[PDB]
Design a protein around this ligand. Structure first.
Ligand code: HEM
Length: 145
C-alpha cells in the first residue's frame, strides 16, 4: 500500500526527473552542507551556483530514476538494492545517515511539487525506511557498521 501511495504522486516527479532532481540535490547541499563533499564533482561549488548547474540536476535525476524503478519493479527488490549498497559503501563511500537526509529532502520536495499530503509523506518515509534498512544491512555484510 505505501508503494502505491507514493506512486499516486509520482507523476510530476517522473515528468521531469532533471528539474526535480536538481531541486533535491540543491536542497540537500543547502540544508546539509556536509553532504556536498561526498560528491567530488560538486564539492566546493558555491551554494548560489548549484540551482542552475545542469550536471547537479542530471545527478539528481539518477537518484529519482532509481527510486522510480524501486517503486515499479515487479521482480526482486533485493536485486535492485544490493548493487546500490555495494557501490555506495565501496566506491562512493557514503555513510548510511546520509540516506536519511536525502529521503527527508525528497519528502519535502514532493510535498511542495507533487501534491504529497500527510498520509503520502508517511508512506514515503516508510518506503525510504525499507530502502535504508536494506542498505544498512548490506553495508554490514561488507564490513561497514
Ligand atoms: C536511496 C537513495 C539513493 C539512491 C537510489 C542512489 C542511486 C544512485 C545511482 C543509481 C547511482 C549511479 C550508479 C551507482 O554508482 O550505484 C548513484 C551514484 C552516486 N551516488 Fe547515490 N543514491 C542514493 C543516495 C545517495 C546519497 C545519500 C549520496 C550522498 C549524499 C549519494 C552519492 C552518490 C555518488 C557520489 C554517486 C556517484 C556519482 C558520480 O559518478 O559522479 N547517493 N547513486
Amino acid at each position: 500500500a505505501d508503494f502505491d501511495a507514493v506512486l499516486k504522486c509520482w507523476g510530476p516527479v517522473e515528468a521531469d526527473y532533471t528539474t526535480i532532481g536538481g531541486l533535491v540535490l540543491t536542497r540537500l547541499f543547502k540544508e546539509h552542507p556536509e553532504t556536498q563533499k561526498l560528491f567530488p564533482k560538486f564539492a566546493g561549488i558555491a551554494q548560489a551556483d548549484i540551482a542552475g548547474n545542469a550536471a547537479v540536476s542530471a545527478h539528481g535525476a539518477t537518484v529519482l530514476k532509481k527510486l522510480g524503478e524501486l517503486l515499479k519493479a515487479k521482480g526482486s527488490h533485493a536485486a535492485i538494492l544490493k548493487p546500490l549498497a555495494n557501490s555506495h559503501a565501496t566506491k562512493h563511500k557514503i555513510p548510511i545517515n546520509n540516506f536519511k537526509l536525502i529521503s527527508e529532502v525528497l519528502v519535502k520536495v514532493m510535498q511542495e511539487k507533487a501534491g504529497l499530503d500527510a498520509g503520502g509523506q508517511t508512506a514515503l518515509r516508510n518506503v525510504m525506511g525499507i530502502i535504508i534498512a536494506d542498505l544498512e544491512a548490506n553495508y554490514k555484510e561488507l564490513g561497514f557498521s
